[PDB]
């Protein structure tokens, strides 16, 4: 229906913070949380792996390669995915570009000790 | 009221599965978990460090000390704190117990790099 | 309501002898050792620990460091659980202040056997 | 009458528990408490002693020696007497039995510390 | 009822100058000496202890180490106490955060010499 | 009117308490406090010098060197001033004596710091 399920009271209180873009005037919301969970099972993939920070990694590890050869739908994931996903590791980004460059270097780092 | 916060979709189904004793006959219910919380606002600690890997760490190391010279009022809430954060880390004990030997095995390790 | 339990028969005897200060003119009774598993309940810690000799050195233990910090409601306590303690042990103090003694140098001789 | 005073509200738990005998169905009762401080008042030995951890060791003492020389109604002194005494040290036995070996051992010791 | 008593007058005038944050604009008033002074006694600590430089040190050295641990109640008190210490020391700071610095650095100083 | 603010509550206790002199029946009352208080605003010093520990040693800097110039208008403050203050600092003197002899060996102490 709309309760709360993926992100707790403590993280829904920053979600409701966290801004789609960093110049924008559009918070997140619940309606961004469920947009995804729909379009998760969509492609065989359980809408509770965003509930869970392990769950997230392994849908943002397929959307990663598939930034430039997917289309739109998996561009919006990939945003929600990514805010949520900083909120249940610790980044706690203002916006969901903050959220792209945070999970962007700490991919360069494994790089150096997995290359 | 009665609603889901604590605990995900995935860990409520854990929960209801792992039993407050190893030898009993009573799996584990919201009411502990709320039963908790209402013990906690009461010691000045929010309930929501519950919903937070986080926030239960900081729980178990009062409680740790207090063990012997707290009362049964806290007996009890280590022994929910516990099954309750072991689902958030990754220990998935089967009962109260085995979330005790767990959790007082990895304080031995720090032990070795903390003497 | 109002029986025996904490002090036995003899216990009793001593018990309503002992005075509450040196210089005063009110001697012990039951209405202190009740006074006193009151609050301690209200701290977590069961009033039963109070009829046993190992129960009451937990109880004291607590309360010595927190002799300055505590307030007015953890003085009293440390003086009931004194007179109290000492009955349980073998000290046969006739007033509080004698009792504080008593377990004041006691603590003492560990200090050279545990410093 | 019938009311509490040789053991505790703690120590009550587990006397009714404790059994008279390893191999009986018959529980520990108040009955047995009273039963005995009645033949010990007729010894010209107070019942009072039996509520002091150091009173039963003087009874102990005397029923040891007395084991094979005293009569029957001496035999079940030393089985209550013994199974109370446990309670008031720390000895926590489930029967009468246990306590008597506990007991007997603990004599052992001195033996070789008082030749 | 709603008098004077832990500020006295020119304490007073400093106090309704103070501000309970840098960037705010609710400056502070006697409902948070007396939010506080109801909240001290609930800790088995006597209000008085407000009243009086020596008494509010023993106060946030409690809290101090209880910063992290403690609850929302014990943050909102070490604020008041702060703004509060303040004024019968000697600093007048001009909100509740530059307190927290004074009394920061005043604790490194002493540090040094008792490392 | 007759209300209170020089002294809290915790120091009205002990200035009702504390007597004017060694060998009388006259202890302290808030006329003494206010007494005073009117004596100092007609020589040009507001009466909240006796609020603040620190205002109290300005007035009896200058009533020190106007013991023996001074008229018995003066002896009278002295008197109070004295009292009063060594509530302020921490001398908990019974009379108004007392508080002459503290006020008097501790200005010899600076005296050996001060030549
Ligand atoms: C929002 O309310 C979340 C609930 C998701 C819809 C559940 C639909 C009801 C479940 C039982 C229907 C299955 C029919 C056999
Ligand atoms: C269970 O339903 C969880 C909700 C907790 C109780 C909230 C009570 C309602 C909140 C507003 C009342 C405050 C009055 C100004
Ligand atoms: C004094 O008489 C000591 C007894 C303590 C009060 C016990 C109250 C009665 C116990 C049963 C009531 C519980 C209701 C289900
Ligand atoms: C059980 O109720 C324990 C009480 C023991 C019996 C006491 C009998 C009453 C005491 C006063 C009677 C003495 C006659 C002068
Ligand atoms: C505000 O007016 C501060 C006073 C605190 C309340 C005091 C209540 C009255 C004192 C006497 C009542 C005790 C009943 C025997
Ligand atoms: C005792 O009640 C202390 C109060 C001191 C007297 C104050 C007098 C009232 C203040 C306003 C009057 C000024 C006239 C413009």
Redesign the interface.
Request: glycine fraction near 30%; charged fraction near 20%; avoid cysteine.
């Given at each position: 229906g709309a309760?709360?399920?993926?992100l707790?009271?403590?993280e829904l209180d920053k979600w409701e913070k966290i801004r789609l873009r960093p110049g924008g005037k559009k918070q997140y919301k619940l309606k961004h949380i469920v947009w995804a969970s729909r379009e998760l099972e969509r492609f065989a993939v359980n809408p509770?792996l965003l509930?869970?920070s392990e769950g997230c990694r392994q849908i943002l590890g397929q959307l990663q390669p598939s930034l430039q050869t997917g289309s739109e739908e998996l561009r919006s994931l990939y945003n929600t995915i990514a805010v949520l996903y900083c909120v249940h590791q610790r980044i706690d980004v203002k916006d969901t570009k903050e959220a792209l460059d945070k999970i962007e270097e700490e991919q360069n780092k494994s790089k150096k000790k997995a290359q």
């Open positions: 309760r709360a399920s993926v707790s009271g403590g509770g509930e869970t």
